[PDB]
Amino acid sequence: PAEDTSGVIKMAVKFDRRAYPAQITPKMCLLEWCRREKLAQPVYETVQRPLDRLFSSIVTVAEQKYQSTLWDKSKKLAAQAAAIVCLRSQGLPEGRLGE
Numbered sequence: 001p002a003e004d005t006s007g008v009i010k011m012a013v014k015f016d017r018r019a020y021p022a023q024i025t026p027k028m029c030l031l032e033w034c035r036r037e038k039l040a041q042p043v044y045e046t047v048q049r050p051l052d053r054l055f056s057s058i059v060t061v062a063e064q065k066y067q068s069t070l071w072d073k074s075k076k077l078a079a080q081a082a083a084i085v086c087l088r089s090q091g092l093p094e095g096r097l098g099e
Contacts, residue, residue, distance in 0.1 A: 005064040009089050012069045015080030019096045026083035029095035033087070034061060042086070044079050057082040 015026060027042070034041050039062050047056035047067075054071040057078040066089065068081040087094045 002062065002064065005062070008058065008065040008067050009085065010067050010069045011085045011089055013081045013084045013088065014068070014070055014072060015077050015084060021095075021097060024095055026080050026087060026094060029093070030059075030061070030083040030086055033092060042083065044082065046075050046078065059083060059086050061086050 017025075020026075030042055033039075043060045045058045045060075047058065048054070049056075049071065052071070053073065055073065055075050055078040056067060056071050057075070058065050058067045059079070059082040060066075066082055066086040068078070068085050070081065072078040072081060084094060093099050
């Protein structure tokens with residue numbers, strides 16, 4: 001239900017685990033959303049700038065790609081950021097404390 005799914009949607013996000021309950025992450029919130037929606041589960045591809053020890057991640061959900069504009073220090077932190085981009089750009093709840 002989102003006709004044009006080309007390209008990449010981006011926002012400027014970094015995952016800050018202090019905003020989340022113990023051991024709940026955007027990846028889990030997004031995965032549960034896909035399951036609730038009977039959607040294929042998210043697919044993450046890592047991007048690297050190894051000379052800077054930087055990481056980015058592109059997540060595909062319902063054929064649309066999402067990615068943060070910002071780089072991070074680890075594959076896992078970048079994957080969390082990509083999940084946030086996917087949720088926040090759609091207006092969905094992100095799983096934070098008191099949301």
